Amino acid sequence: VNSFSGYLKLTDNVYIKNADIVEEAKKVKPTVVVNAANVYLKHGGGVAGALNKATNNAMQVESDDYIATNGPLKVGGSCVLSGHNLAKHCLHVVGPNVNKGEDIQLLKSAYENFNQHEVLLAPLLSAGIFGADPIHSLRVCVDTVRTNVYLAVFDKNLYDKLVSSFL
Ligand SMILES: Cc1cccc([C@@H](CC(=O)O)NC(=O)c2ncnc3[nH]ccc23)c1
């Protein structure tokens, strides 16, 4: 039993809810919140910009030190950093950005990072400003993640389409 409430169950291990991942994180305080990161951990917009703003820029400060030490992530890769006031940890995961020409096949690799964590609160990878089809992102999620994932979809119209079209 966990504290996530109001989700629609899609599969044994994948759940979905129309919610702002920021407000969901502040309420649940999950062990892991997933950020839709880029390779530079520049949290300027989208989910990343929203999560970072909610940390009063502490996420960005921590991320800049991480990059200065370690260099950029790989597309499809991840790193674990602090969750600040939102969660114990933040798993920064880089899905391919279609508006940069990156191989959509890397979306499966991106979701594989979730399997290193028993429970996660997460967005749909490569959706929104990353340019991929969110219906496709959801399919890859369900077919790749085996741990328990609670998906927050900010757009209500997108949420209803994802549910109604799910096979
Ligand atoms: C990868 C990527 C980039 C850009 C945009 C999105 C969309 C996709 C959608 O609508 O779910 N989601 C969000 O931006 C989002 N999701 C949950 N909680 C949130 N809080 C504030 C914003 C926000 C996704």
CA-to-CA distance for 162 and 136, rounded, in angstroms? 10
Residue-wise burial string across 21-43, b where 16 or more C-beta atoms lie within 10 A, e elsewhere: bbebbeebebbbbbbbbbbebeb
Nearest CA to ligand 1 atom 5: 128
Q: Report the first-to-last Cα separation within the chain, whole angstroms.
A: 26
Query: Range of 159's domain?
Result: 8-163
Length of the chain: 167
Quote the number of domains for the chain: 1
Distance between CA atoms of 167 and 142, rounded to whole angstroms?
Answer: 10
Is residue 149 situated within a structural domain? yes
Q: Would residue 101 count as lying in a domain?
A: yes
**Is 155 part of a structural domain of the chain?**
yes
The response to whether residue 132 sits with its C-beta less than 6 Å from ligand 1 reads: no
Q: Tell me if 37 sits within 8 A of 48, measured CB to CB.
A: yes
CA of 65 to the centre of ligand 1 (A): 25
Residue 21 Cβ < 6 Å to ligand 1? yes
Residue 2 located in a structural domain: no
Please list the alpha-helical segments (H only) found in the chain: 21-28, 46-54, 58-70, 106-112, 134-144, 156-164
Residue 46 backbone phi and psi in degrees, to 5 = 60, -155
CA 89/CA 32 separation, integer angstroms: 5
| Atom 20, ligand 1: residue with shortest CA distance | 20
User: Residue of the nearest CA to atom 22 in ligand 1?
Assistant: 47
Cβ–Cβ < 8 Å for 45, 76: no
Query: Going by C-beta distance under 8 Å and a sequence separation of 6 or more, which residues neighbour residue 19?
Result: 6, 152, 153, 154
Resolution expressed in Å: 1.0
Q: Is residue 137 part of a domain?
A: yes
Which residue owns the Cα nearest ligand 1 atom 16? 154
What CA dihedral angle connects 79, 147, 27 and 85, to 10 degrees?
Answer: -20
State how far the Cα of 127 lies from the Cα of 120, in Å rounded to an integer: 17
> Domain of 98: which CATH number?
3.40.220.10
DSSP 6: S
Please report whether residue 3 resides in a domain: no
What are all long-range contacts of 96-104, with beta carbons under 8 Å and residues at least 24 apart? Answer: 96/126, 96/130, 96/132, 97/38, 97/126, 97/129, 97/130, 97/131, 98/126, 98/130, 98/131, 98/132, 99/129, 99/130, 99/131, 102/75, 103/75, 104/132, 104/136
User: How many Å lie between the centroid of ligand 1 and the Cα of residue 72?
Assistant: 22
| Residue 1 counted as domain residue | no
Closest Cα to atom 6, ligand 1: which residue?
Answer: 128
153 pocket-lining for ligand 1 (C-beta < 6 Å)? yes
Return the axis-axis angle of helices 21-28 and 46-54, rounded to nearest 10°.
Answer: 40
In a domain, 158, yes or no: yes
